[PDB]
Design an enzyme around this catalytic site. Structure first.
Site, PDB file in Angstrom:
ATOM      1  N   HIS A 121       0.821  -1.211   0.000  1.00 29.33           N
ATOM      2  CA  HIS A 121       0.000   0.000   0.000  1.00 29.33           C
ATOM      3  C   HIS A 121       0.855   1.261   0.000  1.00 29.33           C
ATOM      4  O   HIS A 121       0.431   2.298  -0.543  1.00 29.33           O
ATOM      5  CB  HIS A 121      -0.999  -0.077   1.154  1.00 29.33           C
ATOM      6  CG  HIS A 121      -1.954  -1.228   1.016  1.00 29.33           C
ATOM      7  ND1 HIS A 121      -2.383  -1.993   2.081  1.00 29.33           N
ATOM      8  CD2 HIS A 121      -2.532  -1.761  -0.088  1.00 29.33           C
ATOM      9  CE1 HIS A 121      -3.199  -2.937   1.641  1.00 29.33           C
ATOM     10  NE2 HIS A 121      -3.306  -2.818   0.327  1.00 29.33           N
ATOM     11  N   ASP A 123      -2.900  -8.415  -7.618  1.00 29.10           N
ATOM     12  CA  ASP A 123      -2.644  -8.774  -6.215  1.00 29.10           C
ATOM     13  C   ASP A 123      -3.535  -9.953  -5.836  1.00 29.10           C
ATOM     14  O   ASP A 123      -4.412  -9.845  -4.969  1.00 29.10           O
ATOM     15  CB  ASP A 123      -2.886  -7.558  -5.317  1.00 29.10           C
ATOM     16  CG  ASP A 123      -2.587  -7.813  -3.880  1.00 29.10           C
ATOM     17  OD1 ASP A 123      -1.777  -8.713  -3.604  1.00 29.10           O
ATOM     18  OD2 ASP A 123      -3.150  -7.095  -3.029  1.00 29.10           O
ATOM     19  N   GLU A 145     -13.759  -8.508  -7.522  1.00 30.24           N
ATOM     20  CA  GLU A 145     -13.497  -9.494  -6.488  1.00 30.24           C
ATOM     21  C   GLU A 145     -14.507 -10.620  -6.634  1.00 30.24           C
ATOM     22  O   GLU A 145     -15.703 -10.360  -6.798  1.00 30.24           O
ATOM     23  CB  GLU A 145     -13.622  -8.860  -5.105  1.00 30.24           C
ATOM     24  CG  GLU A 145     -13.468  -9.862  -3.967  1.00 30.24           C
ATOM     25  CD  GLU A 145     -12.174 -10.637  -4.047  1.00 30.24           C
ATOM     26  OE1 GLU A 145     -11.102 -10.001  -4.168  1.00 30.24           O
ATOM     27  OE2 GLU A 145     -12.240 -11.874  -3.986  1.00 30.24           O
TER      28      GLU A 145
HETATM   29  N1  HZ2 Z   1      -3.674 -16.073   4.046  1.00 31.20           N
HETATM   30  C1  HZ2 Z   1      -4.574 -14.919   4.037  1.00 31.20           C
HETATM   31  N2  HZ2 Z   1      -5.890 -15.119   4.196  1.00 31.20           N
HETATM   32  C2  HZ2 Z   1      -6.759 -14.115   4.215  1.00 31.20           C
HETATM   33  N3  HZ2 Z   1      -6.368 -12.863   4.067  1.00 31.20           N
HETATM   34  C3  HZ2 Z   1      -5.062 -12.590   3.901  1.00 31.20           C
HETATM   35  C4  HZ2 Z   1      -4.099 -13.615   3.886  1.00 31.20           C
HETATM   36  N4  HZ2 Z   1      -2.897 -13.023   3.704  1.00 31.20           N
HETATM   37  C5  HZ2 Z   1      -3.095 -11.708   3.622  1.00 31.20           C
HETATM   38  N5  HZ2 Z   1      -4.415 -11.443   3.734  1.00 31.20           N
HETATM   39  C6  HZ2 Z   1      -5.056 -10.115   3.727  1.00 31.20           C
HETATM   40  O1  HZ2 Z   1      -5.957 -10.055   2.742  1.00 31.20           O
HETATM   41  C7  HZ2 Z   1      -5.345  -9.150   1.545  1.00 31.20           C
HETATM   42  C8  HZ2 Z   1      -5.382  -9.964   0.185  1.00 31.20           C
HETATM   43  N6  HZ2 Z   1      -6.672  -9.817  -0.607  1.00 31.20           N
HETATM   44  C9  HZ2 Z   1      -7.858 -10.615  -0.057  1.00 31.20           C
HETATM   45  C10 HZ2 Z   1      -7.441 -11.960   0.634  1.00 31.20           C
HETATM   46  N7  HZ2 Z   1      -7.261 -13.165  -0.226  1.00 31.20           N
HETATM   47  C11 HZ2 Z   1      -6.400 -14.313   0.199  1.00 31.20           C
HETATM   48  N8  HZ2 Z   1      -6.889 -15.503   0.477  1.00 31.20           N
HETATM   49  C12 HZ2 Z   1      -6.117 -16.545   0.869  1.00 31.20           C
HETATM   50  N9  HZ2 Z   1      -4.789 -16.459   0.996  1.00 31.20           N
HETATM   51  C13 HZ2 Z   1      -4.195 -15.276   0.716  1.00 31.20           C
HETATM   52  C14 HZ2 Z   1      -4.961 -14.185   0.322  1.00 31.20           C
HETATM   53  N10 HZ2 Z   1      -4.104 -13.158   0.133  1.00 31.20           N
HETATM   54  C15 HZ2 Z   1      -2.871 -13.574   0.392  1.00 31.20           C
HETATM   55  N11 HZ2 Z   1      -2.902 -14.863   0.725  1.00 31.20           N
HETATM   56  C16 HZ2 Z   1      -1.744 -15.739   1.146  1.00 31.20           C
HETATM   57  O2  HZ2 Z   1      -1.262 -15.913   2.369  1.00 31.20           O
HETATM   58  C17 HZ2 Z   1       0.256 -15.342   2.422  1.00 31.20           C
HETATM   59  C18 HZ2 Z   1       0.220 -13.862   2.906  1.00 31.20           C
HETATM   60  O3  HZ2 Z   1      -0.166 -13.869   4.222  1.00 31.20           O
HETATM   61  C19 HZ2 Z   1       0.664 -15.394   1.138  1.00 31.20           C
HETATM   62  O4  HZ2 Z   1       0.993 -16.753   0.792  1.00 31.20           O
HETATM   63  C20 HZ2 Z   1      -0.603 -14.932   0.383  1.00 31.20           C
HETATM   64  O5  HZ2 Z   1      -0.470 -15.278  -0.973  1.00 31.20           O
HETATM   65  C21 HZ2 Z   1      -7.054  -8.364  -0.865  1.00 31.20           C
HETATM   66  C22 HZ2 Z   1      -6.043  -7.738  -1.915  1.00 31.20           C
HETATM   67  C23 HZ2 Z   1      -6.310  -6.270  -2.207  1.00 31.20           C
HETATM   68  N12 HZ2 Z   1      -5.685  -5.924  -3.498  1.00 31.20           N
HETATM   69  C24 HZ2 Z   1      -5.772  -5.350  -1.107  1.00 31.20           C
HETATM   70  O6  HZ2 Z   1      -4.578  -4.837  -1.209  1.00 31.20           O
HETATM   71  O7  HZ2 Z   1      -6.509  -5.082  -0.063  1.00 31.20           O
HETATM   72  C25 HZ2 Z   1      -4.059  -8.882   1.946  1.00 31.20           C
HETATM   73  O8  HZ2 Z   1      -3.584  -7.660   1.505  1.00 31.20           O
HETATM   74  C26 HZ2 Z   1      -4.071  -8.921   3.478  1.00 31.20           C
HETATM   75  O9  HZ2 Z   1      -4.629  -7.726   4.053  1.00 31.20           O
END
Ligand code: HZ2
Length: 278
Positions: A22, A162, A116
């Site tokens: 961000h 992302d 989304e």
């Molecule tokens: N594990 C997680 N689960 C739930 N939410 C998570 C997790 N990690 C981070 N977030 C939060 O959600 C935002 C992501 N987007 C929704 C969540 N979708 C997800 N679903 C399942 N796995 C996910 C995941 N995203 C990442 N990973 C994996 O996990 C590790 C990191 O931790 C890595 O391997 C990742 O690859 C919004 C993006 C948007 N453009 C914005 O910038 O808001 C992110 O920015 C954080 O605040």
């Protein structure tokens, strides 16, 4: 009921990766705002919009460690002011995701295109923009938007890619997706977020990215631990195609301070380098 939604809770929101991602998003947005002409912000995997903060959540090790520091670097001010805007009480309760970073920083003339697919996050995302005529919000595949929505009518934009990387195919989808968008809109700024779980996967992704032929590709990476085969995500990065003129200097200015706050042990690294120069 669907008429009154509860904000999404997140354990991860505001972690070190979000801080880096961000920060970079805000710096690009602010640079695009250096010309009066409108631009598009396209968010392929936009999430819920904001997240309600709390196993203590990772925000305590990320955003919480920087947002109230007296010596916050100037390059962080736009990002932190958005965080403050959603947390007037002075306590950290909501973390703004990428769509709300863009909602607060974009101007009256700019546009937002947000997608989304998550069945519970999408209704919240739609709700954050119910009264914002600049925004279009769709429950649709994010990579497809790189074909359908580019180039923007305004011929300027930031494209944030992302995805969750839940599926290994994301590491391929991001590259072909970038290629589809770039072919339609070669002057846009594309910012790709990636996690480092196995360095091998990122090595292969970058190799594929170089094979597209696309030039002017900057890499910004913040590692909290050295590379591993068993520690989960040790690092994350932003790969930026057509980065704004001051981005590389800004990140060199701000990464040492960010790393000192986000990584108390001083482990890992924080680098800016070129995958493919001009
Ligand atoms: N594990 C997680 N689960 C739930 N939410 C998570 C997790 N990690 C981070 N977030 C939060 O959600 C935002 C992501 N987007 C929704 C969540 N979708 C997800 N679903 C399942 N796995 C996910 C995941 N995203 C990442 N990973 C994996 O996990 C590790 C990191 O931790 C890595 O391997 C990742 O690859 C919004 C993006 C948007 N453009 C914005 O910038 O808001 C992110 O920015 C954080 O605040």
């Amino acid at each position: 009921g669907s008429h009154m939604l509860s904000y999404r809770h997140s354990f991860h929101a505001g972690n070190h990766a979000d801080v880096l991602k961000h920060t970079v998003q805000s710096l690009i947005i602010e640079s695009l705002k250096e010309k009066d002409k409108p631009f598009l912000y396209l968010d392929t995997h936009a999430g819920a919009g904001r997240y309600q903060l709390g196993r203590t959540g990772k925000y305590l090790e990320g955003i919480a460690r920087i947002w109230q520091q007296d010596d916050l670097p100037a390059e962080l001010e736009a990002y932190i002011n958005v965080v403050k805007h959603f947390n007037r009480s002075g306590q950290l309760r909501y973390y703004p995701g990428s769509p709300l970073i863009a909602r607060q920083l974009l101007r009256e003339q700019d546009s937002l295109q947000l997608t989304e697919l998550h069945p519970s996050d999408y209704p919240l995302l739609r709700s954050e923009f119910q009264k914002d005529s600049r925004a279009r919000v769709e429950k649709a595949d994010g990579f497809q938007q790189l074909k359908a929505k580019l180039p923007p009518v305004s011929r300027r934009g930031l494209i944030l890619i992302d995805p969750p990387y839940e599926m290994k195919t994301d590491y391929q989808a991001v590259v072909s997706g970038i290629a589809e968008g770039y072919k339609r809109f070669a002057t846009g700024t594309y910012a790709l977020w990636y996690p480092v779980v196995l360095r091998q996967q990122i090595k292969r992704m970058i190799h594929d990215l170089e094979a597209t032929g696309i030039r002017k590709i900057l890499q910004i990476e913040l590692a909290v631990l050295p590379d591993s085969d068993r520690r989960g995500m040790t690092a994350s990065g932003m790969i930026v195609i057509n980065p704004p003129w001051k981005l590389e200097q800004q990140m060199n200015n701000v990464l040492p301070w960010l790393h000192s706050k986000l990584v108390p042990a001083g482990t890992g690294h924080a680098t800016v380098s070129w995958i493919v120069p001009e």
